[PDB]
Amino acid sequence: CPLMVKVLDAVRGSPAINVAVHVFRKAADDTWEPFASGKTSESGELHGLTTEEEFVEGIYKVEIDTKSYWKALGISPFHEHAEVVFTANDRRYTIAALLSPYSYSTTAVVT
Amino acid sequence: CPLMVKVLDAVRGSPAINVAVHVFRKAADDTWEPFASGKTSESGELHGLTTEEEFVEGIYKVEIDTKSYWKALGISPFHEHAEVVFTANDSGPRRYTIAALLSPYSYSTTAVVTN
Amino acid sequence: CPLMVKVLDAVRGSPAINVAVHVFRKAADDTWEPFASGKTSESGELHGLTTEEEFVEGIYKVEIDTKSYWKALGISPFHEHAEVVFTANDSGPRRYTIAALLSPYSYSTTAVVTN
Amino acid sequence: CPLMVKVLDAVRGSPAINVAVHVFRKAADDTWEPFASGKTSESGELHGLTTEEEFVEGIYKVEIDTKSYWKALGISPFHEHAEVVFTANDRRYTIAALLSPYSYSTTAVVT
Ligand SMILES: O=C(O)c1ccccc1Nc1cc(Cl)c(O)c(Cl)c1
Numbered sequence: 001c002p003l004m005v006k007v008l009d010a011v012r013g014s015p016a017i018n019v020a021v022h023v024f025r026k027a028a029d030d031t032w033e034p035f036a037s038g039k040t041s042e043s044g045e046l047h048g049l050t051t052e053e054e055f056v057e058g059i060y061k062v063e064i065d066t067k068s069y070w071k072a073l074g075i076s077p078f079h080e081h082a083e084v085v086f087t088a089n090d091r092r093y094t095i096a097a098l099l100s101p102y103s104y105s106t107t108a109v110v111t
Numbered sequence: 112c113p114l115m116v117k118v119l120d121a122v123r124g125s126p127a128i129n130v131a132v133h134v135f136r137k138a139a140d141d142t143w144e145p146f147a148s149g150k151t152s153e154s155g156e157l158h159g160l161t162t163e164e165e166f167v168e169g170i171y172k173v174e175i176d177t178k179s180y181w182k183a184l185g186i187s188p189f190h191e192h193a194e195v196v197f198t199a200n201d202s203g204p205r206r207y208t209i210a211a212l213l214s215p216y217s218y219s220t221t222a223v224v225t226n
Numbered sequence: 227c228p229l230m231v232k233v234l235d236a237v238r239g240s241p242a243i244n245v246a247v248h249v250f251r252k253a254a255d256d257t258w259e260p261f262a263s264g265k266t267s268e269s270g271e272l273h274g275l276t277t278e279e280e281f282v283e284g285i286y287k288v289e290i291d292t293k294s295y296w297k298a299l300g301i302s303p304f305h306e307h308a309e310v311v312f313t314a315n316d317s318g319p320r321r322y323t324i325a326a327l328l329s330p331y332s333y334s335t336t337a338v339v340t341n
Numbered sequence: 342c343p344l345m346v347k348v349l350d351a352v353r354g355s356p357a358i359n360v361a362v363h364v365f366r367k368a369a370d371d372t373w374e375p376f377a378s379g380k381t382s383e384s385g386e387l388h389g390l391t392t393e394e395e396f397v398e399g400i401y402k403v404e405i406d407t408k409s410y411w412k413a414l415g416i417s418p419f420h421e422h423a424e425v426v427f428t429a430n431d432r433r434y435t436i437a438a439l440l441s442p443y444s445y446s447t448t449a450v451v452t
């Protein structure tokens with residue numbers, strides 16, 4: 001598991017559960033090609049997106065579907081989605097995000 | 112000025128100066144059309160991106176060029192950009208300030224929206 | 227104004243208005259002596275806490291009364307306060323802006339320090 | 342384990358390892374009484390601070406020794422320490438912090 005995504009909720013003080021996450025890899029013609037996707041678990045985590053063989057160097061985008069998350073909770077949000085764009089460089093990447101209705105924090109833990 | 116961007120540096124404790132910012136707007140055909148661009152001043156602020164007339168309803172993407180910022184400082188950072196995507200003006204005109212606080216492997220972003 | 231505090235609300239996307247702020251300075255005997263206090267304006271800013279003369283070197287604690295803020299809004303939050311503790315003016319006078327971005331169970335804080 | 346502390350480093354993209362953490366509980370005369378302490382592990386986490394029997398309702402302060410962390414890395418920091426003050430209310434509390442030299446983010450995950 002070279003890539004993990006973890007999402008937290010700063011309003012409820014909880015994991016952000018059942019958040020849709022879409023990963024894309026940038027193609028040679030600069031378009032974004034679907035790569036992997038899933039929904040966060042009860043712990044706010046999404047494991048199993050990819051494998052070491054399939055996760056080659058390149059630019060990736062992780063699109064967290066925050067708008068739908070907030071609406072399912074009855075809350076009015078600002079962003080369409082949170083976006084995390086980075087280069088994978090030859091390590092286990094954890095992309096974390098801490099969500100509020102009008103704000104988000106994101107970090108990477110690369111170990 | 113209905114759209115302002117402010118960027119801060121969490122390593123130095125300072126405005127993030129000379130940060131390039133590109134704004135896009137989603138077109139009818141669902142592509143990201145160029146909308147405006149500029150770079151932050153010595154206060155970390157970027158004013159003058161657009162006008163009340165040109166800033167219509169739509170889905171906007173504010174792309175803050177954080178990798179280019181850190182690289183100009185001699186630092187290899189994690190993210191390519193910070194990308195702030197939001198629907199604007201769908202209840203009438205509003206004024207938006209998009210703020211970001213930058214570190215090499217992390218950022219925060221918020222919005223202040225006023226009527 | 228060598229010390230300014232700015233507070234934003236990450237739920238509403240707005241300044242955090244009417245936030246009480248208490249500043250303390252560590253005394254010789256290691257207790258926290260009162261130094262200044264005030265509350266944020268309609269822009270989320272608090273100016274006028276102290277003067278160049280009174281703002282000497284020392285260890286300062288800026289206590290932002292976030293629980294009192296959220297409770298006044300009818301919300302039960304996690305933290306009692308946000309507490310920003312730092313050495314000031316130890317290389318000569320500087321100007322400090324302490325900023326905070328508030329959510330019910332979380333906050334961020336940064337400093338902008340200028341000469 | 343009713344209380345866990347996790348600390349991350351936003352400069353290096355890593356857990357913040359060997360950070361000293363001191364917990365205090367507010368006493369009846371409003372002083373802060375030492376309660377528990379430890380150092381974060383290789384994962385940035387500090388487990389085993391207290392037990393359910395010893396962690397009663399009250400106001401607690403978690404003081405993360407960020408200044409010494411940054412100095413051991415050769416970096417010049419702003420804060421003396423990060424402070425997280427909260428009421429425990431009768432759940433497993435995780436206090437997380439994301440550190441930069443001039444800034445920190447903190448959240449609670451209460452599950
Ligand atoms: O908004 C300002 O004018 C500002 C001025 C100084 C420092 C920060 C500022 N904003 C800000 C933005 C984020 Cl994203 C954040 O996390 C925190 Cl704590 C603050």
Ligand SMILES: O=C(O)c1ccccc1Nc1cc(Cl)c(O)c(Cl)c1
Pocket residue numbers: 006094095096097098105106107108109347349437438439446447448
């Ligand atoms: O909580 C975790 O396990 C975690 C794991 C890896 C990276 C970050 C983590 N949490 C976290 C905490 C804060 Cl204060 C924050 O702002 C952001 Cl974005 C994330």
